[PDB]
Structure formats: structure tokens, C-alpha cells
Amino acid sequence: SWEVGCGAPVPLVKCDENSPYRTITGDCNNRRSPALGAANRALARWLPAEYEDGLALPFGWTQRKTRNGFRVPLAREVSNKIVGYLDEEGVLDQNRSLLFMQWGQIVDHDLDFAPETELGSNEHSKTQCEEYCIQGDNCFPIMFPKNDPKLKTQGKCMPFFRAGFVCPTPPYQSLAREQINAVTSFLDASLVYGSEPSLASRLRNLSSPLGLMAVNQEAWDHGLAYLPFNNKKPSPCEFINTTARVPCFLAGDFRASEQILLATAHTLLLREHNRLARELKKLNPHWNGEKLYQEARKILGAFIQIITFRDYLPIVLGSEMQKWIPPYQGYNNSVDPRISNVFTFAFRFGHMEVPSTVSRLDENYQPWGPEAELPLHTLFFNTWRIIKDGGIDPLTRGLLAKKSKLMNQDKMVTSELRNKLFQPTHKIHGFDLAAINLQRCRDHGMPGYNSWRGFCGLSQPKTLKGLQTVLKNKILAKKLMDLYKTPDNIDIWIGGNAEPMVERGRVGPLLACLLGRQFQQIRDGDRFWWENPGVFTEKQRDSLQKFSFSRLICDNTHITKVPLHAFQANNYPHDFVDCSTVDKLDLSPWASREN
Numbered sequence: 001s002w003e004v005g006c007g008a009p010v011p012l013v014k015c016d017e018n019s020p021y022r023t024i025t026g027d028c029n030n031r032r033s034p035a036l037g038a039a040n041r042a043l044a045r046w047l048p049a050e051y052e053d054g055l056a057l058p059f060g061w062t063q064r065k066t067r068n069g070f071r072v073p074l075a076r077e078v079s080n081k082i083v084g085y086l087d088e089e090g091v092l093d094q095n096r097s098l099l100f101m102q103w104g105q106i107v108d109h110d111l112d113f114a115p116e117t118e119l120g121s122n123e124h125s126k127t128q129c130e131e132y133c134i135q136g137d138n139c140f141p142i143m144f145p146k147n148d149p150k151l152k153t154q155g156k157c158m159p160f161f162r163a164g165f166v167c168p169t170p171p172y173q174s175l176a177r178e179q180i181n182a183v184t185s186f187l188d189a190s191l192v193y194g195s196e197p198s199l200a201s202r203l204r205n206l207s208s209p210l211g212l213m214a215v216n217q218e219a220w221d222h223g224l225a226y227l228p229f230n231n232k233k234p235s236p237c238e239f240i241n242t243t244a245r246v247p248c249f250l251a252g253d254f255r256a257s258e259q260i261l262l263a264t265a266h267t268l269l270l271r272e273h274n275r276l277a278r279e280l281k282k283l284n285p286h287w288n289g290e291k292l293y294q295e296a297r298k299i300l301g302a303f304i305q306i307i308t309f310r311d312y313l314p315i316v317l318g319s320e321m322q323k324w325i326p327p328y329q330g331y332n333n334s335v336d337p338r339i340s341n342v343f344t345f346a347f348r349f350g351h352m353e354v355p356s357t358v359s360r361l362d363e364n365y366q367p368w369g370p371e372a373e374l375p376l377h378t379l380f381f382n383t384w385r386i387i388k389d390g391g392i393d394p395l396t397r398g399l400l401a402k403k404s405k406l407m408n409q410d411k412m413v414t415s416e417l418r419n420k421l422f423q424p425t426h427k428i429h430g431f432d433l434a435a436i437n438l439q440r441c442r443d444h445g446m447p448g449y450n451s452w453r454g455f456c457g458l459s460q461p462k463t464l465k466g467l468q469t470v471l472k473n474k475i476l477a478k479k480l481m482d483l484y485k486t487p488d489n490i491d492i493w494i495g496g497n498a499e500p501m502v503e504r505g506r507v508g509p510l511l512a513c514l515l516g517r518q519f520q521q522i523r524d525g526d527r528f529w530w531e532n533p534g535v536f537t538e539k540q541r542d543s544l545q546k547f548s549f550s551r552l553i554c555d556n557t558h559i560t561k562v563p564l565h566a567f568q569a570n571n572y573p574h575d576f577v578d579c580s581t582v583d584k585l586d587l588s589p590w591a592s593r594e595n
Ligand SMILES: *[C@@H]1O[C@H](CO)[C@@H](O[C@@H]2O[C@H](CO)[C@@H](O[C@@H]3O[C@H](CO)[C@@H](O[C@H]4O[C@H](CO)[C@@H](O)[C@H](O)[C@@H]4O)[C@H](O)[C@@H]3O)[C@H](O)[C@H]2NC(C)=O)[C@H](O)[C@H]1NC(C)=O
Pocket: 332, 333, 334, 335
């Protein structure tokens, strides 16, 4: 074993050991071991990393070197033969609204982020990789197979950069390579407030003692706030429409403007913070800016935890929920709350839940205009559609009235993401999210499918025949064997998502195991979990049990008709009720007395 303490985190840390508020970086959550779960630390390894040279080189790097006796198939080839399909008809989830997909992405970004390697401000490497597809140091190209149409119109590869790692970012020689998690492992709304003090600061409105988050000053949504714009140029959001020139938004998380619906969700939460903060000042006129800020923040963090654990996991894990996440019996300081490396791939099941279009609906939940339904790809890093095309209400109604895409063995990832993904850095709508995911497994030195099956105590198929029975699909099992020549080599992302779904769930057995464990840990390992005696009062907890995503929409948008259970498929107007019928968050329990 090697150094039990390498480390390039945010430096200076000193715990308050009486502070009723989480730190921004996640530090100090655990008392005996302060850095546990903090941002900018290595992702946890539940199993040893598997690299071509046992230390840092991904499998597929050295063409001649095999994995278990075989060549690992190209990411894009696996993408073309297994993940793609043409017919979007009949692909929608009959019982999960679009919000189901969307909330998952939110929880996801609150938990883990592995940014790519940074060594380019001045880089021509950013081009020796783009232009020539030359494999070298952190350039690990996604080569196009023979007969791939992109060869004819895009080039020879997709550029792709290895993820950052701990102890430098830079060159050489030590222990196995461990990727970084740039955000806090705890479900704490870090995505709204940021994971660095530096950013948490810039996001706040410190011009007034109200504890509000800064809002846009250039535009308004019917008197409702927008997230401030990011001042930094070049902006990708500006790029997709040189004429509208609208920048990306500035939020606690850098991926916020990835897609219009994710930016919509971010806006709702920022709105709830300021809403909470002003409602609190009304009750406690005495409280200062900091107190207003921390108490609202604390409330919002409880909201995310509650919606996630009460309404969202149950319908992901289905019958497996109880098997992995038992009833809460209290905080446990012996539990490692860190997000593991494999979790960040397991949680990518959501990619197969994204449909090809996004709609905007009007007050009666009718098409908003002539071009109400747009292709997903035209909305990547698209903020001008919100700002100069209706605000977020038409988008939010879409989230409630439309359905998520159903994971389907014959139709996995929509072409909008498989062939038209737009990356921050480059200029085309031609990347492949599926291939990227696959290349990224290898980059992260992930163990194979069967290593994880064994880890979860599940059978491990060694034969085509064995794979057919687990996957319950003859044809899918076959193309898989043809490309991988052995189950042991199947990349975890595609292997875990190819399994049939569990009863009342949306993921298979393997994924339910990987997801379930992770979630039980960040709950049980969180000293600030909302139900942990002492964090909130019994009276406060009674009030928080009433949160609902519907109420959230009611208090921060001009939608007045909403469903009671926002994550299940809901038809308008039968399943929609007036906001008055929806429980409000009673904040009197936060009222404070001096004398
Ligand atoms: C907070 O979470 C902690 C981390 O999970 C929990 O710690 C675990 O503690 C148990 C022991 O109490 C550890 O193993 C389990 O308990 C028994 C070991 O004493 C085992 O009993 C069996 O041991 C083997 C069989 O496996 C036999 O030889 C023996 O005769 C008996 O059958 C259990 O089967 C079980 O493994 C375990 O190492 C800890 N978990 C890990 C890996 O960290 C702790 O329970 C929690 N604290 C509390 C009590 O709330």
C-alpha cells in the first residue's frame, strides 16, 4: 500500500465543532475524520482500479495490449451497434414525467463531478488532439470505426480528454491514478450554493443584509428572478446564436446551462432560496444576512434530501429500495460518505431516459406557439430560449405534462445525444454521449461487468448462453459477445444498463445494488441528514415532511394548476389541481424569541 495521505485539496480548514451549518466544502461533516466527503478529493474506490499498465493507462490505449486476452472494442463502435436506434415512436415512459429524468440529473450534479484535465489556456494541445487525433498524455481520442458516417463528415475522431486526478493534475510517477470529485459527496444543494468558498461568495448578494443570492439584473421573468449571467467569455451559450448573444448562467455548479431544462430547474431553486430568506426576515427581523443565508440554505438542503429519498429513489429502485436503503436508525460516524468512482457511471442510467424533444406549453397546457416542440440538440447550452422566448413557465409545464424516455434494450440513447451532443469546448453538434461514457469508464480504470456482479453478490455469466439469461435478451447478448468476446470485459456503464429493470423500478439488479449502497451511505454518513436528532426540531421536521415539488412550482412560478405527485405521468387537466390544494411549507416553527 502507498501514501495514506496524498492530497491537493482546498487548503486551510478549521472546524467550528458547534456550528449548526454545513461548511461549503463539505469539510468538518465527520468529526474524527474531517476531510471525509469534502469536495476536491479523490472519488472513493470500492474495488481496485484496473488500468492497462496497472497504474494509469486506460484499457484500449496500447492497441496491442489486451484485456483478458482480447482487444477492447472501440467506444463509438459499441455505441453504433448497441446503443443507437432511429424510431422515437413508442419510446416514452408511460408512468414517469419528464421531471423524473430531470430530478435525477440534479441529484447527480449535487453528488459528483470529475472535471477534465486543465493544462490549457494557451494550449495547441487542445488542437493537436482536435485536428490530428493524435493520442498523447491527456488526449485519449474516440476513433471512428470503419463505415461510421461521421468519418465522411466530421473527421477521424472525437476529441476527448482524460479526467483530472489527485496529487497534481500534471505529469508523473506514483500510486494508481485516482480521479477527483470536485463537489461535496453529501446531498446538500451544493449545486445551488457551490462547493468552493470562492464561488459560494460570488453567488451571494452581499450588497444587502438579507441573505439573498444574486439575481440577473439584465432580464426578468414577469417579475421573477433569473440566475445571473456568467461574465466570462468565450461563452458556449453565446456561440450557438451569435445574434442573440445570450451568455450561460452562473450557478453553484458549472454544468448548469448544459441543457435548457436543467437551467430551468436551477432557476426554481435559486428562487426558493430568496423566497425562503425573505419569508424568514419577516419572522425574524433581527436575524442578520449570514443567518438568513444559512437558515434558508439549510432548509433547501433538507428539501433536496426529502424529495430525493421520499419521492424519487423509491421509483428508481422499485422493490429493491428496502433491500438497500433500510429505515433510518440514526447517524453513523463509521460510514464512509464519499461518492465512489463507479457510482458516477452507475448514475448515468439517466442518459437513456432523455427523450428527443422538449416542449413549451401555455396556461391551458397547449403548445406554446408554432415551434412549441424543439429537438433536444438545439437546446444544449441554450439560454436565449428562456430569456427571449417565454421565460421558464412554459418549460416547467412541459416538465409536468411530458414523459421521460423509457430505457429500452432495443432503443437506449436518443440520436440527439448519440450523434448531436454539443461540447463546451468545441464548435459542432456532433459528439456521442454514449461513446464518451464508455471511453470514460476506461479512463476511470473501472473493473469489468462481472467484477461488479460479484461485488453485488450476483451471478457472473461466462458464456453467451449465460449472458442471454441474465440480460433476458438473445440478440442483445449476442452483439455484446461479438464485440467484447467475454462478459468480463463488458464496460460497467453499458453492462449495468443492459439488464432488465426490477419490479416497479427503472434500473436492473446490478445498478440497484450500486445505487442503493451509495445512497444508504451518504444518508447514514451525513451528520447533517435532516432526520438526525438535533439538526432540525421535531416541530420543524413536521413542517418539512410537507414539502413537495408541486408546491415549489406553485411558490416560484405563475403556474396555478399542478399535479399532486409530480414524478408519475400526469394528464391535463384530470390529474391537475389548483395550487391551493397543495400543502404549503409552514415556517412558523422557525420563529425565534429573544426575551
Ligand atoms: C455503523 O456502521 C458500521 C459500518 O457498517 C457498522 O459496522 C459493522 O459492524 C459489524 C460488527 O458489529 C461488522 O461485521 C458484522 O457484524 C459481525 C462481526 O462482529 C458479523 O457477525 C458474524 O461475523 C462472522 C460472519 O460474517 C462470523 O465469524 C461471526 O461468528 C458472526 O456470524 C456480521 O455478519 C457482520 O459482518 C462489520 O465489519 C462493520 N461494517 C463494516 C464493513 O464497516 C455498525 O454496525 C454501525 N454501528 C451501529 C451498531 O449502528
